Amino acid sequence: LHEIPRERPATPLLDRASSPAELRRLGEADLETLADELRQYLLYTVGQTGGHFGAGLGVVELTIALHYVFDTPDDRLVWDVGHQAYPHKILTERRELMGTLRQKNGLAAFPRRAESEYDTFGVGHSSTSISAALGMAIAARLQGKERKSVAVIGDGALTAGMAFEALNHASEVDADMLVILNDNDMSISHNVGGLSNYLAKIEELGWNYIGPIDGHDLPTLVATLRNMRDMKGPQFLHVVTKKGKGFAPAELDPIGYHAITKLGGPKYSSVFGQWLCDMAAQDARLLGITPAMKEGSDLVAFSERYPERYFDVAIAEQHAVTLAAGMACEGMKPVVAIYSTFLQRAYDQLIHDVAVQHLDVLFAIDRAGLVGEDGPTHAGSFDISYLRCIPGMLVMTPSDEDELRKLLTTGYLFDGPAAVRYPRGSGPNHPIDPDLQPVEIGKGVVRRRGGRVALLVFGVQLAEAMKVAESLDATVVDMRFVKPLDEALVRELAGSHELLVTIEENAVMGGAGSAVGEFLASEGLEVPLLQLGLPDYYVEHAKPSEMLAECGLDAAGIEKAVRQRL
Amino acid sequence: LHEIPRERPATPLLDRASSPAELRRLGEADLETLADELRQYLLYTVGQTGGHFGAGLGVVELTIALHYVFDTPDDRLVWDVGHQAYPHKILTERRELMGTLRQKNGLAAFPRRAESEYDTFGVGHSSTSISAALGMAIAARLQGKERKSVAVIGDGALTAGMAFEALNHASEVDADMLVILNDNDMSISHNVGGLSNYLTLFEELGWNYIGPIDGHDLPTLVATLRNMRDMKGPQFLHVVTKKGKGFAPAELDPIGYHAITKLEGGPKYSSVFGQWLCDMAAQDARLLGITPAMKEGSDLVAFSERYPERYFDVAIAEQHAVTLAAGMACEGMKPVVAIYSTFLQRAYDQLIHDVAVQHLDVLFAIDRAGLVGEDGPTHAGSFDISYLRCIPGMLVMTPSDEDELRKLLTTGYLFDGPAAVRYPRGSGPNHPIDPDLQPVEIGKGVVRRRGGRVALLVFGVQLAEAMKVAESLDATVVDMRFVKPLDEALVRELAGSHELLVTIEENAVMGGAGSAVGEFLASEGLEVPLLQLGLPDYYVEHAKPSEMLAECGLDAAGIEKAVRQRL
Amino acid sequence: TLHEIPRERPATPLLDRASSPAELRRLGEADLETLADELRQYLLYTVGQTGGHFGAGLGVVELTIALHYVFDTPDDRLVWDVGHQAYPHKILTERRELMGTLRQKNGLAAFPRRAESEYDTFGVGHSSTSISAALGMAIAARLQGKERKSVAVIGDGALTAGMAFEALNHASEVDADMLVILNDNDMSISHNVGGLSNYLGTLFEELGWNYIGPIDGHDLPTLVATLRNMRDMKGPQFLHVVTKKGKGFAPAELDPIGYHAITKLEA
Ligand SMILES: CC(=O)c1sc(CCOP(=O)(O)OP(=O)(O)O)c(C)[n+]1Cc1cnc(C)nc1N
Ligand SMILES: CC(=O)c1sc(CCOP(=O)(O)OP(=O)(O)O)c(C)[n+]1Cc1cnc(C)nc1N
Ligand SMILES: CC(=O)c1sc(CCOP(=O)(O)OP(=O)(O)O)c(C)[n+]1Cc1cnc(C)nc1N
Ligand SMILES: [Ca+2]
Ligand SMILES: [Ca+2]
Ligand SMILES: [Ca+2]
Ligand SMILES: [Ca+2]
Ligand SMILES: [Ca+2]
Ligand SMILES: [Ca+2]
Ligand SMILES: [Ca+2]
Ligand SMILES: [Mg+2]
Ligand SMILES: [Mg+2]
Ligand SMILES: [Mg+2]
């Protein structure tokens, strides 16, 4: 196909395969026709709602063959990451709900146990499928159940150390389970690493290896899976698919068609990428590291201009950070670009390898806060809380594009570990100073001098706080730093106002507001304190504006909370 | 050798090899005599100070060969974990300082950059060597330097996922570095895993594989290392050693001689956990026990022997341990993940994303919570209250003694969802232990003393010290039991009836349990003075556990001074 | 503990020469734990072949060995209540190699049966008859001057029946020399629901019995030593033993209701 259908296509066979049991009533001869119907229904629905695209097209045939051969849901199927599971959802009683995908109160971006009995494991982060399938298999064997356990993992997800740990342990316990490698020679960008090179060529770690087989040959898939369903012990099936199969533009541009949109101001990631290039042009020591997120974190231009100083480590957050630590030992200046939600997988390397040694590493933490449709598996809700308790960390929260550039510079030049957090999307579109100069560490900026109540803002809610301050005539501080905190300013405001209000796009528990509270307590300052931030639950996916409103982090919610406290 | 020398042995050659430069002036025919003298000194000094034992004996020859062939410190040598690096320190200008090993203001337990230019990377946690060495190699090439990069990694450390990530990336960048696999077929316990069975995969990943060679044949070591030193690209040398080599008692008992105490109470909290795990497993066939290669430390020994079909050592793979538990819980089994606070840092994402987000029924038994003593800051359990209590769904508990640990383990286990119970290394006040297996009410503290003006809210094992302070001051003391959910009702009552609330925890004050109390007081508009006592915002230098606690003010003397200074 | 039912005869060198109690009693005590393992293996295999009751027999593997080891069967009278847990008993009383005929036409019966073996003292099936039966044998033996022991093994479920209460009270009255062993696993077929289960030894002593226990029913050293002591004691004796239904087969330990009985395995 060359165009996405704008009208609900005619899919008669698909309508008779609304569940795996119904699918298993059809004949093998019908399956090739079912793959075409599903493929064009998939194209139609993702065009109506936007979402992940190319990966799911590559597993249309594998998904049909899997539910046709295995006794789902009793047999356990685990999809790694889950961004390729739209065909799965379509064949597990959610076809007619795909119109709600990634919308408020609609289907989630990824498989979710609470969403369907056909989803064995909630995924989003990568490389968890083998571990989860192994735990299921170990349980089923002790329980005496005959159910099968199958994990479908892509070549990109297989680059994570946690997959290596699972493969080794599964061999050790002689688990009866099937690992299906979905090898399309791609991640989001092209795959990197020695593992990818080996996979282009052609298992000794205790796995019975079968393949490679054509992942779009349904007759072959069905026959191979049938043979391996009943084989005992760790089984490894190597399948080859083409990302975007069946849609020519995606087959040609698999990076651009990894995800699509349905039917001003630079993105913060783009402000970072420009700062990265500008600083690299002035300082040969700068090295840029990403764990397989060149496009999202936006190291595109940097990777092209400075290929010798750009490092894609695959989906290996752990190694990215310890690698940077080693680079810093030689006097180089590494910058680790990493989403807040993925940095929690490198927490030990940040603490033990960087912070304990006070090494000069800059962490550019994108997707800080609520990320919208991708939902809670990807929310950057905790990085202020889990970083600010670590000795040696300089923790910064820019409030707009200009502040991001300046605080990146400040943390980069700081001789020690530094973190700069910023959200998905674009900002208030304020002018950006082209110079590359730092700001004083541990000093906030008073954006508005008023009275009675003072709003201490850590990050991008500053614009909303300024609106609230218009009606209440409040003081507004752009705090800039969580750690070290501008204690002198906090002390002054605590003595001159009747209420301090902290605002952050991070869990209230342990967050920036609590750093202010810790300081007030240590000095015996008794001013009332209202802490605004993310609540202690997982916010259901929706538009970012809807999630912020639910959490009370828009002007309306902030004003309501302040007035009620007053 | 058969006995540890009690008097300093005569080592005329070792005395002439106080640094690598001096060592390299010696002749090859001298190195095997030096190896003998080093082994004797090592036995002597570790006998004097206590410390890690068997692993270092295994690398005596490897260490000599490495510093003899490579141009250290210009060439970069990275030891994985570093518990096997005493010979390294003996040969790098620290032999006569080994008498201070693991003592306050003395040499650290592991290599440490601030301690010596010969220590390229501070280690303690495992499996970081390849990543660090690759970063130095990359930097050196970009800088136009011609230095070598070497990483020595044991077969146990190689089971971690981050070592796999590093091997994969090094091939991609075609870095000039040497990885030496120190294979003795052991971890702390026996190395169990699919990789130990295998021990080519290294060849297929882009590495030039040489070996296996005799890690105790100095002539072969020097010749082989010399050959690969100037080879280009990723090089991988497979070496075979014996843990405890040259000391028969250690060769015969490698577990017990992994570490020794210097030559010449109640149960350890780990032992209380081990007994609880066996007792609960006897009553519930669904319980499964998981450890990442720490059967001895967390004390799953009896459990592993009695319930071998429900015990799982995943090797040094903290990440897999947690997600594996998540999968088990999906099928209705009841996994208990035994993990040190410092090592749970490496599985944070799996706890959040695979367990907490799904509210799966997994119990985390968090040992070595707080200051751990001589192992120093790399192993401190300083942060688990802070990094867990911010996670929605987590039940976070802090027992104050042995009976409380048993009760809260039962409480966390019976709770249907993610639960964490944290406790320190060592033993406790030795209070009576109720043999029953009964939970306590969730989110409720216990008032242990009723006093007047100060209320001490204790989260964990400082309770006994706080009781001493409260008897001196006639103060109120609360055994909080739970960080999350907090006993808000009790905190509210004490905030109205006392002039000062004092929170005490063996965790970072920043983000800690005291800050949970602060968050509550602020949200309710309660403005009672609050004094937060806990671990400071720096890395506490190694010493005896009591000396480190005294430094942090978490003994009775420090607590009382802090309280009275506030008042 | 196993996870799979053996599909082929396991090697059981010790069991094979413990074909009868007299032969079992010639083995040393240090070999009984290994025999327990082999018996359990064979039980899993043969019941996988024929069908049959399952979990209850797994729970009394060790009890059965100790009973035939300490008591002089078949001269000493052993009575199994219900009898669905008596496959180990049959395996040790000259019927191991006949278990392949279990519950088939012209093969071994589902329960102990006097006509089937001199080692079966009482045909059972309905529950709670063992105390009554053993007491009748004890009274008769005393009257005919024959010094023999009388033992009833009854489960906690079977003990809820009124007739077990009648028998306990009469035995105390006549001061009979007999041993009642309560096989307590907190199960009937379903979970054991009732007042007696909640109580589970004051009740038994008030009724006139010498109560001992609770002891671990899978600790052979303890079982043998305890049974030897009570064998040398007279009058109404009551031993409280605690077992795990399905012991040694993890699927059964996890689903005791569903593994009360199984159907023949199919390939
Ligand atoms: C959207 C998202 O979260 C994806 S999808 C994807 C590529 C995985 O490639 P794979 O070969 O496994 O699948 P394929 O698309 O079929 O080729 C990445 C890196 N990510 C981001 C990411 C980064 N890091 C981690 C630990 N997890 C995730 N999910
Ligand atoms: C004491 C400590 O920190 C050691 S030493 C060791 C195994 C050493 O095995 P290896 O084969 O690498 O070396 P060997 O002793 O010479 O055989 C472990 C698991 N630990 C604890 C541990 C647990 N988990 C992690 C991530 N790091 C460490 N250091
Ligand atoms: C299958 C059959 O006939 C069994 S087994 C059993 C309970 C077994 O519990 P017990 O504690 O005595 O032994 P255990 O299995 O070892 O726990 C019952 C009620 N039944 C049915 C039944 C019902 N009612 C009567 C009078 N007799 C019998 N046998
Ligand atoms: Ca796109
Ligand atoms: Ca600005
Ligand atoms: Ca300027
Ligand atoms: Ca905004
Ligand atoms: Ca539980
Ligand atoms: Ca302590
Ligand atoms: Ca008093
Ligand atoms: Mg791929
Ligand atoms: Mg080893
Ligand atoms: Mg019963």
Ligand code: NA
């Ligand atoms: Na020892």
Ligand code: NA
């Ligand atoms: Na059944």
